[PDB]
Amino acid sequence: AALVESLNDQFARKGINFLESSPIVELSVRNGSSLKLQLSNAHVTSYKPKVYWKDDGFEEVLYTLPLSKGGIGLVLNDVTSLLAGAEWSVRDVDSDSFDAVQVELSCTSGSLEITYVVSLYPESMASAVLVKNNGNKAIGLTSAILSHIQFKKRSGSGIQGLQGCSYCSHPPLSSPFEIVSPAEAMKAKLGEWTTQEVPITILKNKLSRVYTAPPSERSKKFYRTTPSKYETVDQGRELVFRVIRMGYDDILVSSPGSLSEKYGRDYFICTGPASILVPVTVNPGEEWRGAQVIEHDNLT
Amino acid sequence: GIITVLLGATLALAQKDIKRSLAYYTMSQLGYMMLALGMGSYRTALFHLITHAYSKALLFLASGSLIHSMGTIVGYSPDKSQNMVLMGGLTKHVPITKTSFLIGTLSLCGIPPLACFWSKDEILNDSWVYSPIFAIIAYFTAGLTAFYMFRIYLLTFEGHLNFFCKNYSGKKSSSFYSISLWGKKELKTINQKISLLNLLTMNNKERASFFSKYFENKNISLYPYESDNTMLFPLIILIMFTLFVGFIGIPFNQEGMDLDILTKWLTPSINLLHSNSENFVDWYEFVINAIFSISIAFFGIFIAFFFYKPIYSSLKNFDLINSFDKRGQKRILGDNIITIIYNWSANRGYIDAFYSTFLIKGIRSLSELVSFFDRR
Amino acid sequence: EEEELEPPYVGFAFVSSVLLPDGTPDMHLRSATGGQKLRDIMLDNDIDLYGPYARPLLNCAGGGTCASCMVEVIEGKELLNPRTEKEKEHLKKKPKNWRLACQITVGTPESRGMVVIQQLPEWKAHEWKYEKDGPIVSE
């Protein structure tokens, strides 16, 4: 518990607090949006932004289960897992006048320095990962910031903005924070690379797709790039949450179908930026950056 | 009256200004009044005048208060503060104005038990007695009126604030905070290169290799809010008027032989269509014979809901929208209605421009010609 | 010594009006055969052209009367036809590169150039400043 007191004496500010409910950092802003991030592992367990103009208009976004399941989890594995058993330590925090807050966690893995930056803005939340190489050999690694978005009902849950983007049926990248196993998601029609034609992806059925440009198409001068923004639509509580991908070149989308009945009453999907089909190389002394942003326009 | 009805209904379908569409279908309702007067329905025309004046004042005052609310975020220009394109998602911000506008819309969509429902469906029944073609045009106008009124309401109150939507407006972004997304290592006004944007920071894409020959603003959170109480109080009074003024032409608490306030007011009154039927209508029986008008109004409301309701609304099904994928921007649909309706509404029905081309300029030339004959 | 190197195409680089949260402007790439209208290309390739005017009856849909067709042409003005009568009518007091996309034909089906287009120029939070031709920068 003395670690929590030391973190309060060192880094606590207006909107940044540290509790022991495992040490967790609570990020808060002026309008009342809250964010819980575990410090033992880089896991965001709760995101409650203000979406209604009532006195209690804070709505939970992430689907969180006990034993560190669900939520937002940074994954970084090497193919040429680097986060298992990692000792995450807080580097520094920053704040903009109680309007925006930010916390940085630092970890080392072999010769790689990994920084996880989690920030709150009055209508958005951002999670970024920066890996810096310090060794004498270039690495090849994959990564994915997967977020489990909670929907009120299985029907009326959809994704808007992926129309015309080619999708490949591919198993989700294995993470310590899975709700459904990659085998129980039926993994993937294996690599069909179908182009989505409907404007809305319906998530009432069990699907596991990656939305991106095909790796063969990425070697040309002009090609249909991966969409940067895509919205999740929840008709149960009338909420649209926009996801922005930077650095990554893929969008993982996964739905459990009937399996969501096992873990609770509320529906959920697992979506987020990813770099899986084409592993990303990092030369010695280079740096790779990736980021997922969840915004919402429900206040306007 | 019927020509004015059809023209006013068809001229407000594809307008972006709220007050212009309000004027056009004001003209449509006045044409309805003149149509009722054309068959000799004195009492029905006066009933429609009484109900429509109060509902129209309610809707116009609500629109003005809403324009006043939007002028704090888009400025005082009427090209911006009266544009329903940039106006969505005002239900959360102006609730009293939302209720007033919704009540006026329901009154003038012919939905019971509001004001203009009784007058309008009396007009429609009298027109069917008059002639079938006029009744067909009037019922189609009622459906169109429902469509464009709920189009206005959905464009103006449901959705997101299109002016402040982060999908389009880049001014209300998260990059303008001192908190940098990547960490405590980013600052300075950046000046990029289209070549760097082309290579996507994935150096290997350097194939062009040649040519072919802003912070410190600071942003705050601004939201529209409801206007002052002096604007809201007449809205409440007109809400009460709209709710309870349809009972002066209908009998209030009919018990046997009971004449309403309006027919006792106009005891000597011209009535050519019903000069022999001294019938007493009933409060809960008129909605039985008015199934057709409410059905067509609900059809128009369903069309407006399909066109303009937000994607997160539970009434909008994903599969139905998938059936309306219209992939390829199907040209059979584009010029069937959308181009034609938009050109009809934007060019004001082509009459006014003709009045500029034929009369106005002509009279100008005539003046000059006369001046020439007075000078030379 | 060339088998045409590819089937003929025109590359399009679209810059969105809204910047990414890190401050870098959004960039999208498409490839479409020449001879088609820019409106017929942007909607076919799912590129935001109208903005909030994309809903039905809010745009002229190729009629030319609506001003929601308007884009900013950064590069590729050689591949595009000059300003027409409707563009001249609807683009008074606007900059010269500001063009209506639906009143634009992108060359011919045997074109190979690159066209760089900024979408929704009225909603921009940045600006483009040309410097001795060549280098084109954004603030």
PDB file of N, CA and C in Angstrom, chain A residues 163-165 221-229 244-246 289 293 295, chain C residues 9 11-13 16 18 20-22 26-31 45-46 114:
ATOM      1  N   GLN A 163     -17.437   0.191 -45.108  1.00  0.00           N
ATOM      2  CA  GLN A 163     -17.968  -0.163 -46.416  1.00  0.00           C
ATOM      3  C   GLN A 163     -16.893  -0.024 -47.486  1.00  0.00           C
ATOM      4  N   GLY A 164     -16.801  -1.028 -48.355  1.00  0.00           N
ATOM      5  CA  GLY A 164     -15.845  -1.022 -49.440  1.00  0.00           C
ATOM      6  C   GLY A 164     -14.444  -1.453 -49.076  1.00  0.00           C
ATOM      7  N   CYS A 165     -14.194  -1.808 -47.819  1.00  0.00           N
ATOM      8  CA  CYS A 165     -12.877  -2.238 -47.375  1.00  0.00           C
ATOM      9  C   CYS A 165     -12.819  -3.761 -47.368  1.00  0.00           C
ATOM     10  N   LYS A 221       1.907   1.944 -55.734  1.00  0.00           N
ATOM     11  CA  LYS A 221       1.948   3.385 -55.501  1.00  0.00           C
ATOM     12  C   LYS A 221       0.638   3.885 -54.908  1.00  0.00           C
ATOM     13  N   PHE A 222      -0.487   3.496 -55.502  1.00  0.00           N
ATOM     14  CA  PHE A 222      -1.801   3.898 -55.024  1.00  0.00           C
ATOM     15  C   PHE A 222      -2.658   2.661 -54.816  1.00  0.00           C
ATOM     16  N   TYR A 223      -3.211   2.530 -53.614  1.00  0.00           N
ATOM     17  CA  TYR A 223      -4.050   1.398 -53.260  1.00  0.00           C
ATOM     18  C   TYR A 223      -5.055   1.858 -52.219  1.00  0.00           C
ATOM     19  N   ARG A 224      -6.166   1.131 -52.125  1.00  0.00           N
ATOM     20  CA  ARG A 224      -7.207   1.468 -51.161  1.00  0.00           C
ATOM     21  C   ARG A 224      -6.691   1.203 -49.753  1.00  0.00           C
ATOM     22  N   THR A 225      -6.374   2.272 -49.030  1.00  0.00           N
ATOM     23  CA  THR A 225      -5.749   2.146 -47.724  1.00  0.00           C
ATOM     24  C   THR A 225      -6.759   1.696 -46.672  1.00  0.00           C
ATOM     25  N   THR A 226      -6.227   1.276 -45.530  1.00  0.00           N
ATOM     26  CA  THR A 226      -7.063   0.908 -44.395  1.00  0.00           C
ATOM     27  C   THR A 226      -7.806   2.136 -43.882  1.00  0.00           C
ATOM     28  N   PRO A 227      -9.108   2.034 -43.605  1.00  0.00           N
ATOM     29  CA  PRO A 227      -9.826   3.173 -43.021  1.00  0.00           C
ATOM     30  C   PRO A 227      -9.261   3.542 -41.656  1.00  0.00           C
ATOM     31  N   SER A 228      -9.196   4.845 -41.394  1.00  0.00           N
ATOM     32  CA  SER A 228      -8.630   5.334 -40.145  1.00  0.00           C
ATOM     33  C   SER A 228      -9.663   5.458 -39.037  1.00  0.00           C
ATOM     34  N   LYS A 229     -10.919   5.734 -39.378  1.00  0.00           N
ATOM     35  CA  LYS A 229     -11.975   5.925 -38.396  1.00  0.00           C
ATOM     36  C   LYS A 229     -13.129   4.979 -38.688  1.00  0.00           C
ATOM     37  N   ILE A 244     -10.409   5.523 -33.772  1.00  0.00           N
ATOM     38  CA  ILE A 244      -9.389   6.021 -34.686  1.00  0.00           C
ATOM     39  C   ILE A 244      -8.125   5.199 -34.482  1.00  0.00           C
ATOM     40  N   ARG A 245      -7.557   4.723 -35.586  1.00  0.00           N
ATOM     41  CA  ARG A 245      -6.335   3.932 -35.597  1.00  0.00           C
ATOM     42  C   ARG A 245      -5.203   4.761 -36.186  1.00  0.00           C
ATOM     43  N   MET A 246      -4.060   4.792 -35.496  1.00  0.00           N
ATOM     44  CA  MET A 246      -2.841   5.354 -36.062  1.00  0.00           C
ATOM     45  C   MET A 246      -1.683   4.395 -35.834  1.00  0.00           C
ATOM     46  N   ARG A 289       5.383   3.367 -33.388  1.00  0.00           N
ATOM     47  CA  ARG A 289       4.317   4.037 -32.660  1.00  0.00           C
ATOM     48  C   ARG A 289       2.963   3.533 -33.140  1.00  0.00           C
ATOM     49  N   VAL A 293      -7.813   5.584 -30.455  1.00  0.00           N
ATOM     50  CA  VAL A 293      -8.571   6.661 -29.826  1.00  0.00           C
ATOM     51  C   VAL A 293     -10.053   6.321 -29.898  1.00  0.00           C
ATOM     52  N   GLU A 295     -13.496   8.214 -29.315  1.00  0.00           N
ATOM     53  CA  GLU A 295     -14.212   9.464 -29.108  1.00  0.00           C
ATOM     54  C   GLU A 295     -15.711   9.212 -29.158  1.00  0.00           C
TER      55      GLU A 295
ATOM     56  N   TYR C   9      -4.557   3.825 -64.965  1.00  0.00           N
ATOM     57  CA  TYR C   9      -5.305   4.265 -63.798  1.00  0.00           C
ATOM     58  C   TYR C   9      -4.898   5.689 -63.456  1.00  0.00           C
ATOM     59  N   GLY C  11      -4.290   7.818 -59.906  1.00  0.00           N
ATOM     60  CA  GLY C  11      -4.180   7.756 -58.461  1.00  0.00           C
ATOM     61  C   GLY C  11      -4.745   9.013 -57.823  1.00  0.00           C
ATOM     62  N   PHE C  12      -5.431   8.827 -56.697  1.00  0.00           N
ATOM     63  CA  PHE C  12      -6.068   9.913 -55.969  1.00  0.00           C
ATOM     64  C   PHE C  12      -5.591   9.893 -54.527  1.00  0.00           C
ATOM     65  N   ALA C  13      -5.171  11.053 -54.033  1.00  0.00           N
ATOM     66  CA  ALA C  13      -4.754  11.221 -52.645  1.00  0.00           C
ATOM     67  C   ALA C  13      -5.694  12.221 -51.986  1.00  0.00           C
ATOM     68  N   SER C  16      -8.421  14.572 -45.611  1.00  0.00           N
ATOM     69  CA  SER C  16      -9.645  14.842 -44.877  1.00  0.00           C
ATOM     70  C   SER C  16      -9.579  16.204 -44.193  1.00  0.00           C
ATOM     71  N   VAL C  18     -10.703  16.849 -41.140  1.00  0.00           N
ATOM     72  CA  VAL C  18     -10.412  16.685 -39.721  1.00  0.00           C
ATOM     73  C   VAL C  18      -9.038  16.045 -39.561  1.00  0.00           C
ATOM     74  N   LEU C  20      -6.007  14.040 -37.564  1.00  0.00           N
ATOM     75  CA  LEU C  20      -5.913  12.946 -36.618  1.00  0.00           C
ATOM     76  C   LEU C  20      -5.584  13.498 -35.231  1.00  0.00           C
ATOM     77  N   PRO C  21      -5.891  12.743 -34.168  1.00  0.00           N
ATOM     78  CA  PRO C  21      -5.642  13.256 -32.808  1.00  0.00           C
ATOM     79  C   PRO C  21      -4.185  13.569 -32.500  1.00  0.00           C
ATOM     80  N   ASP C  22      -3.230  12.999 -33.231  1.00  0.00           N
ATOM     81  CA  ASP C  22      -1.829  13.342 -33.022  1.00  0.00           C
ATOM     82  C   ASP C  22      -1.411  14.607 -33.761  1.00  0.00           C
ATOM     83  N   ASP C  26      -5.142  13.615 -41.950  1.00  0.00           N
ATOM     84  CA  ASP C  26      -5.574  12.317 -42.445  1.00  0.00           C
ATOM     85  C   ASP C  26      -5.346  12.219 -43.948  1.00  0.00           C
ATOM     86  N   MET C  27      -4.902  11.047 -44.392  1.00  0.00           N
ATOM     87  CA  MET C  27      -4.557  10.815 -45.787  1.00  0.00           C
ATOM     88  C   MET C  27      -5.134   9.479 -46.227  1.00  0.00           C
ATOM     89  N   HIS C  28      -5.781   9.465 -47.388  1.00  0.00           N
ATOM     90  CA  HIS C  28      -6.316   8.243 -47.964  1.00  0.00           C
ATOM     91  C   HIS C  28      -5.888   8.154 -49.420  1.00  0.00           C
ATOM     92  N   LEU C  29      -5.713   6.928 -49.900  1.00  0.00           N
ATOM     93  CA  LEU C  29      -5.256   6.683 -51.259  1.00  0.00           C
ATOM     94  C   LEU C  29      -6.266   5.814 -51.991  1.00  0.00           C
ATOM     95  N   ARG C  30      -6.544   6.170 -53.244  1.00  0.00           N
ATOM     96  CA  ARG C  30      -7.444   5.404 -54.092  1.00  0.00           C
ATOM     97  C   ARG C  30      -6.865   5.345 -55.498  1.00  0.00           C
ATOM     98  N   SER C  31      -7.362   4.398 -56.286  1.00  0.00           N
ATOM     99  CA  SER C  31      -6.991   4.278 -57.689  1.00  0.00           C
ATOM    100  C   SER C  31      -8.254   4.094 -58.513  1.00  0.00           C
ATOM    101  N   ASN C  45     -15.650   4.976 -54.288  1.00  0.00           N
ATOM    102  CA  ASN C  45     -14.544   4.548 -53.447  1.00  0.00           C
ATOM    103  C   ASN C  45     -14.766   4.875 -51.976  1.00  0.00           C
ATOM    104  N   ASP C  46     -15.983   5.286 -51.607  1.00  0.00           N
ATOM    105  CA  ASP C  46     -16.369   5.591 -50.225  1.00  0.00           C
ATOM    106  C   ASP C  46     -15.468   6.670 -49.619  1.00  0.00           C
ATOM    107  N   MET C 114      -1.352  11.818 -61.128  1.00  0.00           N
ATOM    108  CA  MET C 114      -1.740  11.783 -59.724  1.00  0.00           C
ATOM    109  C   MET C 114      -2.545  13.031 -59.399  1.00  0.00           C
TER     110      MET C 114
END
